Amino acid sequence: KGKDYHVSLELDLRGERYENALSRVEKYLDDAVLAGYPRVSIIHGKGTGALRKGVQDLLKNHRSVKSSRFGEAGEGGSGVTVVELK
Amino acid sequence: IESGIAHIRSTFNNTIVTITDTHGNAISWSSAGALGFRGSRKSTPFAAQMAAETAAKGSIEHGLKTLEVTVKGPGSGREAAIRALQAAGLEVTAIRDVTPVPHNGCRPPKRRRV
RNA sequence: AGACCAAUGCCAUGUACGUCGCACUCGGAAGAC
């Protein structure tokens, strides 16, 4: 039984660096292993570059994620990275 | 047919998309009305986003990879279609904000509330 | 301060560098007491 630890459905990493973002993102993605859920959305605001490429590549290589897709009209256009869980 | 130029009009009612060659020769085009939006929905960013990937699909089969985009007029479709292009797998090398800005031009039409 | 000091088989001994960045839009009709 998985009951002693809780999981959420949204990620917030405003202004984080590449490696800190990696550390928090991997934990966030692996949290739902025992409590799966449909998908999640990622928002930062704005930044000084394009680490979305690395984030998307890691998500597509993630073991417990079936796939990753993008957002509809209610999800800030198709620019928002959406992680489709199993 | 490897390089081209994608032109998109960003109006307040519609968003056209057209691609051309460096010699200014068209290949294919699309639009919200082309896809099936008839009303004010054509002005939504979603309609322009759809327009983007249909233009991309009409582009690939003729074998063009690299693009650079010219945007005309102000509208909600400014941000949608440009990133829809790279969402469609293509590669857009530059963004050009070319709009007709006359120095004085012609006297504009009357006001909307008289 | 002032006695005695003759000698150390062969090789090669390293490793070692050239560092940085994430994402949201403009708006019908409505008369009179």
Angle of CA points A25, A31, A35, to nearest 5°: 145
Name the residue in chain B with its Cα closest to that of A75: B46
Residue A45 one-letter amino acid? G
Residue B102 one-letter amino acid? P
Containing B27, the helix (H) or strand (E) segment is strand B26-31
Please count the helices (runs of H) and the strands (runs of E) in chain A: 2, 4
Taking CB atoms and an 8 Å limit, are A77 and B45 in contact across chains?
yes
The protein footprint on chain C, as nucleotides within 7 A of a CB, is 20-27
CA–CA distance from B7 to each of A11, A12, A28, B17, B30 (Å)?
36, 36, 40, 6, 11
Resolution in A: 3.4
Structure tokens at B24: 């200014």
Residues 6+ apart with CB under 8 A from A43: A11, A12, A76, A80
Q: Could you check: is the Cβ of residue A47 within 7 Å of any atom of nucleic acid strand C?
A: yes
Taking CB atoms and an 8 Å limit, are A73 and B87 in contact across chains?
no
A→B interface, C-beta within 8 Å: 70, 72-73, 77-79
Which method, experimentally, gave rise to this model? cryo-EM
Q: Would you put residue B89 in left (φ > 0), alpha (ψ -120 to 50) or beta? A: left
Longest dimension (CA), chain B: 52
